[PDB]
């Protein structure tokens, strides 16, 4: 999937996200919600936010941010050996939350954006390459599980 050199890059970048999981989590979800308003409708607890200020002022949104990035970090530290960690995720987003694979695409892009925004100039081309490949692997493995379930939509 990835070489050990590329995994090394991913984990180096992840070190930036661990220094402020809540600020990073928050900005990823705001970037998603503002850029793709339909994603907001999948969250009954956040569908009430209409402005970004409101979003920025929501402590519950920062909390969910932490939950998401904690789960992602766990998976990335497995360097592709994440079947155990991913099956459950895949299963709940397909059967319970009914999240199209496309939104995983969106959040993937929103991570890259936020890293460039918070770390201008020290999110290099090699680092971007490794991070993108890692997210792709994650997305691909999810998609495999969605297929088994026939979560067509
Ligand atoms: C980077 C990928 C993602 C990660 C690691 C992630 C992680 C999580 C985790 C750990 C939970 C709580 C446990 C569970 O319900 O399985 C959760 C809940 C949820 N996720 Fe995700 N998620 C991701 C992507 C998304 C996307 C793209 C959407 C929607 C556009 C989404 C929608 C939801 C919803 C609606 C819930 C339930 C929230 C609640 O009411 O508490 N997830 N997610």
Swiss-Prot record:
Binding site for O2: 64
Family, similarity comment: Belongs to the globin family.
Top enzyme class: oxidoreductase
GO terms for biological process, alphabetical: oxygen transport; removal of superoxide radicals
Function: Monomeric heme protein which primary function is to store oxygen and facilitate its diffusion within muscle tissues. Reversibly binds oxygen through a pentacoordinated heme iron and enables its timely and efficient release as needed during periods of heightened demand. Depending on the oxidative conditions of tissues and cells, and in addition to its ability to bind oxygen, it also has a nitrite reductase activity whereby it regulates the production of bioactive nitric oxide.
Residues the entry annotates as binding heme b: 93
Assigned keywords, A-Z: Cytoplasm, Heme, Iron, Metal-binding, Muscle protein, Oxidoreductase, Oxygen transport, Phosphoprotein, Transport
Residues noted as binding nitrite in the record, renumbered to the chain: 64
Organism from which the protein derives: Equus caballus
Subcellular localization: Cytoplasm, Sarcoplasm
Protein name: Myoglobin
Catalytic activity: Fe(III)-heme b-[protein] + nitric oxide + H2O = Fe(II)-heme b-[protein] + nitrite + 2 H(+); H2O2 + AH2 = A + 2 H2O
Enzyme Commission code: 1.7.-.-, 1.11.1.-
């Amino acid at each position: 999937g990835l070489s050990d050199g590329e995994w090394q890059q991913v984990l180096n970048v992840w070190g930036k996200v661990e220094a402020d999981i809540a600020g990073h989590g928050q900005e990823v979800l705001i970037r998603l919600f503002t850029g793709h308003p339909e994603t907001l409708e999948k969250f009954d607890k956040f569908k009430h936010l209409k402005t970004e200020a409101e979003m920025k002022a929501s402590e519950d949104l920062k909390k969910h941010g932490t939950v998401v990035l904690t789960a992602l970090g766990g998976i990335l530290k497995k360097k592709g050996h994440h079947e155990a960690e991913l099956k459950p995720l895949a299963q709940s987003h397909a059967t319970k939350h009914k999240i199209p694979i496309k939104y995983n695409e969106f959040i993937s892009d929103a991570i890259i954006h936020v890293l460039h925004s918070k770390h201008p100039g020290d999110f290099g081309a090699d680092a971007q390459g490794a991070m993108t490949k890692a997210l792709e692997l994650f997305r691909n493995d999810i998609a495999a599980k969605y297929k088994e379930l026939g979560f067509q939509g």
